[PDB]
Amino acid sequence: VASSSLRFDLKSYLKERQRQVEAALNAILPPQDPPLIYESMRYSLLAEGKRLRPILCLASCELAGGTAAIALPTACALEMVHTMSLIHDDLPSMDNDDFRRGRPTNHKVYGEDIAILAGDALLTYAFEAIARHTPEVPADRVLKVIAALARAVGAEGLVGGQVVDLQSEGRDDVNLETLHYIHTHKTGALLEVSVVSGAILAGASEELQEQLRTYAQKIGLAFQVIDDILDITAKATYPSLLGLDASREYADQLITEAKAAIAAFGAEADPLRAIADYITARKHLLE
Amino acid sequence: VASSSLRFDLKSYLKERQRQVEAALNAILPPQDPPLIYESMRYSLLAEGKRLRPILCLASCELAGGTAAIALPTACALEMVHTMSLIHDDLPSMDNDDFRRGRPTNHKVYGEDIAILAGDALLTYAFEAIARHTPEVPADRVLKVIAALARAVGAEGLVGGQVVDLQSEGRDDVNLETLHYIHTHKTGALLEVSVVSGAILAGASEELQEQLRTYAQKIGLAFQVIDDILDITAKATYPSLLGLDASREYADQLITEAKAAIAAFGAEADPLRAIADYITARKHLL
Ligand SMILES: C=C(C)CCOP(=O)(O)OP(=O)(O)O
Ligand SMILES: [Cl-]
Ligand SMILES: [Mg+2]
């Protein structure tokens, strides 16, 4: 049974929030000098994206009683960090991809040196945007956002995940603990901080923060498990490690835990519920 | 006339402060999981360095009435950012160097992918160390350090400088404006924030912060001008753009402005003065 309001239109909500996010991104990082670095940063940042991390941040902030206005810099920051992770991941020294967000990868247009530096500058600007542009929130909470984002993106999060992912590439012995580590760190950490950052800015209790963290962790993992089921319902995977049946049950357990974490809230949780209902629905429609 | 105390031993002061910084670096970033990323980050971070940016930070904090203790996380952060700039600069796609800090470059040991990621994780950890580990400093000051370091290291500072440096590589038309931009942004920005960050944490006035910023900007530029004079006393340079004589006068004007900026202070400014006296002394001896 879908948790969100029966009429909730997720496609419509995401489209509006995407436009709002993309207008904020354009204004927060305007063309500046030297033109080439700002051109390269904006090339990747403003390329077509779903903007799910910023949208989760704004939604979590609102759910916790805050405004979009206080969260928008942090929302932009999450997208800058996500964008710089893709720029670095696409590089010839990493995945060596020719295409990203429907255009040539940054390094194909600007060279590997400029792409690396554009990534470095977007990572740095994420922290500046939060520190310099976050309105009304007391410094102590903005610093908590800085610390949480930094922990989520570095060796304890996104980069730690990227490293184990790279170490796993040539191997035939990847176990569930490794696969779980990659999903929770390479992708999970930043999803978690996207919702938790919104709650911190709003001044939410540690309890509320932890409920959103659980939501994000479980919905993130449910997404990866269902993705692996879809791949074979058409290199360690949930099916290759658990079998198909236990993968289906795990996905259902993950969605149930995600929905439970935000069960207490009213209509402000509808966007997060709709995201879970959609991922649930895609799971059920194979069975 | 040297501005610092007659007996001030800069070599001794730097060696003691280097030891303190390197102990802090080892404790703030201990080996952790996955081991390979922490090993790569520590490989470059704990390689032989003069540690001038952390030392400037600690010295500036103390000059402003603060302790080394409140500044040590920020000092480590400045060294992390400096270290990640060298890791990325050494990459095949950039300067393609085989050696850094007396050992093989990070990417020669760990591969280009791990070196990139080590650099990204050091950049990130710099902001975490300031925000998480700064001991009992008012949040508003710590947030100003985050904003100032981010501005100093990004497209408005260090990265902006690296980019114009890369764009200048193949050119025969590099003018004084461009050379000045590279020196003030690629190198100057992070020196400036090293001294200003210490002062901010200590709760120094805007005025004091601005005087330390002038000190760092002028001493940084004086260093680059004198380096160019030494190179030909042995590609746009101060001599190739100004000629030798105006380069010498410029260097002396820069050191004079640097010393004037901190003239008012007592013995707590002696380390900054001794750094200026040493750079002056190297100029005059040619
Ligand atoms: C989280 C990061 C660093 C990006 C994911 O890169 P992958 O190689 O896993 O996938 P793509 O986004 O490149 O397709
Ligand atoms: Cl996504
Ligand atoms: Mg990859």
Ligand SMILES: [Mg+2]
């Ligand atoms: Mg990829």
Ligand SMILES: [Mg+2]
């Ligand atoms: Mg998968």
Ligand SMILES: [Mg+2]
């Ligand atoms: Mg270089």
Ligand SMILES: [Mg+2]
């Ligand atoms: Mg170099």
Ligand SMILES: [Mg+2]
């Ligand atoms: Mg030179």
